[PDB]
Design a protein around this ligand. Structure first.
Ligand SMILES: CC(=O)OC[C@H]1O[C@@H](O[C@H]2[C@H](OC(C)=O)[C@@H](OC(C)=O)[C@H](S(N)(=O)=O)O[C@@H]2COC(C)=O)[C@H](OC(C)=O)[C@@H](OC(C)=O)[C@H]1OC(C)=O
Ligand SMILES: [Zn+2]
Length: 257
């Protein structure tokens, strides 16, 4: 189906998902000198104290750490958000080289990787209904740069060997997502879409200004994963990022000056 290769990559997605050329697609380049500081933006509230992780799965495009979202255990509120959004999963997008990998860019600068913590608006009952709404999801995006190791990320790095190929999953309970957050919660926000097919335009993007640092050793293990399934020719899971899309009729707001 769709992928990140030359014959099934981002350039081809519009054929099966025409919304790929839509009015509010993601990611986008964040021009820091065009973003407007919005003093009306309420404080961002990340409540991950009761977060309940369940499993880690290699889905052939990236790996997802899933959470129990039957209750308001881990939620995102405040900021440009109205209501409560429950955390359902997080995953990353990374490159084959340290100079690329992130989906959003800042003044055209590409980071080594990007973490996406996905949340859905509880007013819609379930994730499936939420993705069909303009304000159905809220995704917290965090850039990763290569530097010092990130303690909170090692638990994830340690289990990647058990889900090397597509379809593989492993138990992943008691993981605290709070360990992946930078010190500052300053952010940029704009209305966008999922960055992978079906590319639904149901996302309120909240991209943090401050990146987190990960070690070269940690990123290297990400690059050892496989897009292919067990018993098939090896295709390293790298460069699973969509490039920046036209901003069009949208404004990016900043929570800071
Ligand atoms: C289109 C549809 O019917 O439902 C929407 C889809 O939601 C997908 O979940 C994420 C996706 O997680 C993945 C791919 O595991 C997420 O991260 C990716 C693709 O790497 C992207 S992203 N980059 O914008 O954060 O968004 C997708 C939308 O859901 C979000 C943001 O929470 C589901 O899993 C996928 C695509 O793998 C996907 O499941 C499919 C397709 O079978 C689909 O959900 C449904 C109803 O199946
Ligand atoms: Zn993503």
């Amino acid at each position: 189906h769709w992928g990140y290769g030359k014959h099934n990559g981002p350039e081809h997605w519009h054929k099966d998902f025409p919304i790929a050329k839509g009015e509010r697609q993601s990611p986008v380049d964040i021009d820091t000198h065009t973003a407007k500081y919005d003093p009306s933006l309420k404080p961002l509230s990340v409540s991950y104290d009761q977060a309940t992780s369940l499993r880690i799965l290699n889905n052939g495009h990236a790996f997802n750490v899933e959470f129990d979202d039957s209750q308001d255990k881990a939620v995102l509120k405040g900021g440009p958000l109205d209501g409560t959004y429950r955390l359902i999963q997080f995953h990353f997008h990374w490159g084959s080289l340290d100079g690329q990998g992130s989906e959003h860019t800042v003044d055209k600068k590409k980071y080594a990787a990007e973490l996406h913590l996905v949340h859905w608006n509880t007013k819609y009952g379930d994730f499936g209904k939420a993705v069909q709404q303009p304000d159905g999801l809220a995704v917290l995006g965090i850039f990763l740069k290569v530097g010092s190791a990130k303690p909170g990320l090692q638990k994830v790095v340690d289990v990647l060997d058990s889900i090397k190929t597509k379809g593989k999953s492993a138990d992943f309970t008691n993981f605290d997502p709070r360990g992946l957050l930078p010190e500052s919660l300053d952010y940029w926000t704009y209305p966008g879409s999922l960055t992978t097919p079906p590319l639904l335009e149901c996302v309120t993007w909240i991209v943090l200004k401050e990146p987190i640092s990960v070690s070269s050793e940690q990123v290297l293990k990400f690059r050892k994963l496989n897009f292919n399934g067990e018993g098939e020719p090896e295709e390293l899971m790298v460069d699973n990022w969509r490039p920046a899309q036209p901003l069009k009729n949208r404004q990016i707001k900043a929570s800071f000056k």
